[PDB]
């Protein structure tokens, strides 16, 4: 049958556009967290009657929906350089006005709450979202996206606000209470609501139950370099985060990984010589029953060749954890199974 | 012989990139002035030993040279999102440190003075320039250019600082003390230092002496719509401004022009129906001996078709004046004759 789909379109990362400009990365600042600094994909949504359309990133690592407000205080706030949600053009709009305060490492986003029909992936969810009236100039003024759509759980929602997906489940009909992500090896990308597209995977899905109530995180049994397991011997966590673009781990663990690879460090990223790249061994993540491998081609891009792995010492609530970002999902088609509270993987195509 | 050339490359205007984003233009602010808001061309220069290269617009409407400083106060200033001039990497650098204060309608740019060899268009001028330590977030953070290079006169230089071209004349050898601008009908654009490229014009140049000491401004005898002269009957001024992209006049005069054209006003720009466009009559500017015509194709781009004419009530020192911007120069190859203090025009090709 005909699916329910959100297409993902390529956009320049706010880091990328800085390189195009020619910015010195080291002279920036040291940079309740997801920068979207290297996020390179977005979909569109509608908000309200007539739908006011917005470019948004879909982030399984957070549980709020927010867009810029028409009530941004002119030039002062730096949100006025995106599309703004005018409530006076929506008949379905419903007032709320409870202040909301999302804190990021680069700055504090402020705004108020609002209710309205959201059109997404060919369907209408009545959502409660944030109307932002103050924005951090640093990342967001360079952004090509207008806002954020959480695909996380109520537990990680500021204000205990029901996430667009909960609302999708409870109100109205999806076939199955799941959703999947898929990236092309490259306008390339697709979310499906209520299914997995068979054309974009092969073989069979394999599942790992989420280890804790309200987050898309799972137990990882070991990280293997070449043929032998290096770190995560006694078990660590793996956060599947569609808002993140790369794989990340604790600095403790990331040091180890790169030493074995023989990738000398740049203070910005980890790099290898472009000749030596293809030689680099396979990395494999031990998740549930199966071993999920990433070849050199998958995580590599005369001496200037940067890798798709980074370090992120994530704070202790979600805990020390790894982060399977977009780079993993590009090779491994992923299904988020809210009905059974598990994540499932298959080879992409 | 081999010329001395600065190639001009196309960049998205900070207005353009806002439209690509989808910004409401009316919800911005009302916007010692040239915004470069619709500027779409830049060249590169070097500054110092090893040349630190910068993307800059060449603006005959101003007489200062300035780039961003390595001493921008981190994230606070919003200049750190461009290339920065590090004085500690230049052997030719010479301290000055006299504060400089360029005022714009959107904000006040602050910085200090510095001396160094500038490499431009295949030659070295020792210049004194501005190192900017504070920048307006509004236009400049969206900019694709790093800085500005004045092609104006000492009179319109903040700090009475000698303009790169004066210095070019006095020190070292150009064949003739002139320079020309040329835009392709479209990476397209070229300045020549010390000559005019014969390949990019046809026929003979015709000249108009500058009417006052220190500005690229000239007497215009009349503005003709169709066959009959409408405004500037008793004579008005015409500022040839390479930093401006469009033609502009006093609002008094611009109202008149558009009424005769039958182009209904949008609060942002002046617009016409795309069917009706090609019908629009020829406009002709009466400068010196010859009549300089612009057909519909030259100033026009179902009902959405915006024109290349705008209104700018320029303050009374430079006076009520018109502004022949890049759109005029695209059809009419222009030579700036500093030796004889005149401007000369020819048909471009
Ligand atoms: C902004 O919206 C929040 C959240 O609202 C809830 O979801 C919306 C989509 C609608 O369906 C609302 O009807 C719904 O409340 C508002 O806060 C909530 O206020 C209600 C009362 O109006 C609180 O309910 C109470 O529950 C206790 C038992 O636990 C009863 O004893 C009380 O009598 C009462 O019914 C509820 O706790 C509260 N929820 C949260 C998360 O704070 C908020 O009022 C609203 N602000 C506005 C409209 O100005
Ligand atoms: C920053 O630079 C300015 C401008 O400097 C001038 O141009 C430079 C490229 C160099 O060639 C400099 O040598 C040159 O001065 C400085 O200001 C200038 O200071 C000089 C004195 O050092 C002033 O000259 C005076 O002229 C009068 C006569 O009119 C004599 O009686 C005096 O004895 C003296 O010679 C000059 O007026 C002044 N120019 C301006 C525009 O202000 C500035 O000092 C410098 N700051 C530094 C290095 O800290």
Three-class SS of residue A101?
A: strand
CA distance A160 to A65: 12
Distances (CA, A) of B270 to A133, B164, B262, B308: 31, 36, 10, 8
What are φ and ψ of residue A260, in 5° steps? Answer: -60, -35
Shared-domain flag, residues B105 and B179: no
Shared-domain flag, residues B227 and B112: no
Is A138–B75 a contact, with Cβ atoms under 8 angstroms apart?
A: yes
- Closest-CA residue to B149 (of B240, B51, B36, B15): B36
What are φ and ψ of residue B37, in 5° steps? Answer: -75, -35
Ligand that lies nearest to the alpha carbon of residue B154, given by its number in the listed order:
2
Q: Ligand 1 test: best mutation among A64, A98, A100, A164, most atoms within 8 Å of CB?
A: A98
- Closest-CA residue to B129 (of B47, B205, B216, B27): B47
What are φ and ψ of residue A303, in 5° steps? Answer: -95, 5
B98 lines ligand 2 (CB under 6 A): yes
How far is A78 from chain B, CA to nearest CA, in Å? 8
Contacts with B316 (C-beta within 8 Å, 6 or more apart), sequence order? none
Shared-domain flag, residues A258 and A242: yes
Find the Cα–Cα–Cα–Cα dihedral A166, A171, A175, A181, rounded to 10°: -30
Strand order in the sheet with A190-193: A5-7, A190-193, A178-182, A332-337, A342-348, A201-209
Does a structural domain hold residue B24?
no
Structure tokens at A161: 């606000």
Shortest CB distance from B80 goes to which of A22, A27, A83? A27
Shared-domain flag, residues A207 and A107: no
Does a structural domain hold residue B7?
no
Shared-domain flag, residues B78 and B53: yes
On whether the CB atoms of residues B221 and B292 are closer than 8 A, the answer is: no
B100 lines ligand 2 (CB under 6 A): no
Give the total number of structural domains in chain B. Answer: 2
On whether the CB atoms of residues A291 and A49 are closer than 8 A, the answer is: no
Structure tokens at B35: 């915004």
Last-in-domain residue among B126, B141, B174: B174
A contact set with B (CB within 8 A): 18, 21-24, 27-29, 55, 70, 74-75, 78, 80-84, 137-138, 141-142, 144, 146
Domain span at residue B213 reads 175-349
Contacts with A174 (C-beta within 8 Å, 6 or more apart), sequence order? A4, A168, A193, A194
Distances (CA, A) of A126 to A28, A62, A167, A339, B118: 40, 19, 7, 20, 60
Shared-domain flag, residues B256 and B138: no
CA distance A42 to A57: 4
- Closest-CA residue to B25 (of A260, A83, A233): A83
- Radius of gyration (C-alpha) of chain B in whole angstroms: 20
Full 3-state SS string of B3-53 = CCEEECEECCCHHHHHHHHCCCCCCCCCCCCCCCCCCCEEEEEEECCCCEE
Distances (CA, A) of B82 to A287, B49, B72, B218: 43, 20, 10, 36
Does a structural domain hold residue B6?
no
Shared-domain flag, residues B208 and B332: yes
B167 lines ligand 2 (CB under 6 A): no
Shared-domain flag, residues B102 and B235: no
| B146, closest residue in chain A (CA to CA) | A21
Ligand that lies nearest to the alpha carbon of residue B160, given by its number in the listed order:
2
B184 lines ligand 2 (CB under 6 A): no
Shortest CB distance from B81 goes to which of A23, A55, A70? A23
Does a structural domain hold residue B281?
yes
CA distance B143 to B39: 9
Residues of B identified as active-site = 59, 241
Paired with A249 in beta bridges are: A311
Is B18–A144 a contact, with Cβ atoms under 8 angstroms apart?
A: no
Does a structural domain hold residue A8?
no
Ligand that lies nearest to the alpha carbon of residue A171, given by its number in the listed order:
1
d(CA A178, ligand 1 centre) in Å: 28
Shared-domain flag, residues B155 and B247: no
Shared-domain flag, residues B133 and B218: no
For B23, other C-beta atoms within 10 Å of its C-beta total: 18
Paired with A55 in beta bridges are: A44
Structure tokens at B344: 């000369």
**H helices within B78-171, ranges in order?**
137-140, 164-170
Is A74–B29 a contact, with Cβ atoms under 8 angstroms apart?
A: yes
Last-in-domain residue among B152, B174, B196: B174
Structure tokens at A299: 């995580």
Paired with A237 in beta bridges are: A219
Shared-domain flag, residues B328 and B180: yes
Last-in-domain residue among B117, B145, B174: B174
Does a structural domain hold residue B259?
yes
Of all protein residues, the one whose alpha carbon is nearest to atom 15 of ligand 1 is: A96
Domain CATH number, residue A133: 2.40.70.10
Instruction: Describe chain B by its helix, strand, coil percentages, rounded to 5.
Output: 15, 40, 45
On whether the CB atoms of residues B52 and B85 are closer than 8 A, the answer is: yes
B97 lines ligand 2 (CB under 6 A): yes
Paired with B119 in beta bridges are: B46, B124
CA distance B315 to A5: 55
- Closest-CA residue to A287 (of A337, A213, A346): A346
Does a structural domain hold residue A12?
no
Full 3-state SS string of A205-233 = EEEEECCCCCCCEEEEEEEEECCEEEECC
- Closest-CA residue to A240 (of A194, A285, A280, A204): A285
Give the pairing type, strands A5-7 and B217-225: unpaired
Distances (CA, A) of B17 to A7, A40, B14, B38, B187: 23, 17, 5, 10, 17
CA distance B313 to B324: 14
| A56, closest residue in chain B (CA to CA) | B21
CA distance B325 to B241: 5
Does a structural domain hold residue B14?
no
Shortest CB distance from A21 goes to which of B24, B27, B82? B82
Three-class SS of residue A24?
A: coil
Q: Maximum distance among all alpha carbons in chain B?
A: 61
Give the pairing type, strands B236-240 and B322-324: parallel
Distances (CA, A) of B189 to A129, A339, B179, B192, B308: 48, 60, 14, 10, 18
B128 lines ligand 2 (CB under 6 A): yes
CA distance B231 to B218: 16
On whether the CB atoms of residues A59 and A153 are closer than 8 A, the answer is: no
How far is A211 from chain B, CA to nearest CA, in Å? 39
CA distance B244 to B226: 25
CA-angle at B243, arms to A78 and B122, nearest 5°: 115
CA distance B183 to B324: 14
Shared-domain flag, residues A104 and A194: no
Gap positions in chain B, given as the residue before each gap (C–N > 2.5 A)? 31, 186, 301
């Amino acid at each position: 049958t005909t699916f329910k789909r959100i297409f993902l379109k390529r956009m320049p990362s706010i880091r990328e556009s800085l390189k195009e400009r020619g910015v010195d990365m080291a002279r920036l600042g040291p940079e309740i967290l997801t920068n979207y600094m290297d996020t390179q994909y977005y979909g569109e949504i509608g908000i309200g009657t007539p739908p006011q359309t917005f470019k948004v990133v879909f982030d399984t690592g957070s549980s709020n929906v927010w867009v810029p407000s028409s009530k941004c205080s002119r030039l002062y706030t730096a949100c006025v350089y995106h599309k703004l949600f005018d409530a006076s053009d929506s008949s379905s709009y419903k007032h709320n006005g409870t202040e909301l305060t999302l804190r990021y490492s680069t700055g504090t986003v402020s705004g108020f709450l609002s209710q309205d029909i959201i059109t997404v992936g060919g369907i209408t969810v009545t959502q409660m979202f944030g109307e932002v009236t103050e924005m951090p100039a640093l990342p967001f003024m360079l952004a090509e996206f207008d806002g954020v759509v959480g695909m996380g759980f109520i537990e990680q929602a500021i204000g205990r606000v029901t996430p667009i997906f909960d609302n999708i489940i409870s109100q109205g009909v999806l076939k199955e209470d799941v959703f999947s992500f898929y990236y092309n090896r490259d306008l390339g990308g697709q979310i499906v609501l209520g299914g997995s597209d068979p054309q974009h995977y092969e073989g069979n899905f394999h599942y790992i139950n989420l280890i804790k109530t309200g987050v898309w995180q799972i137990q990882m049994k070991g990280v293997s370099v070449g043929s032998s397991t290096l770190l995560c011997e006694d078990g660590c966590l793996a956060l599947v985060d569609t808002g993140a673009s790369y794989i990340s781990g604790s600095t403790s663990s990331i040091e180890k990984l790169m030493e074995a690879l023989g990738a000398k460090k740049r203070l910005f990223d980890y790099v290898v010589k472009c000749n030596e790249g293809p030689t680099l061994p396979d990395i494999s993540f031990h998740l549930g029953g199966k071993e999920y491998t990433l070849t050199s081609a998958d995580y590599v891009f005369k001496k200037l060749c940067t890798l798709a792995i980074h370090a992120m010492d994530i704070p202790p609530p979600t805990g020390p954890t790894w982060a399977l970002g977009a780079t993993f999902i590009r090779k491994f088609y992923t299904e988020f199974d809210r009905r059974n509270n598990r994540i499932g993987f298959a080879l992409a195509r």
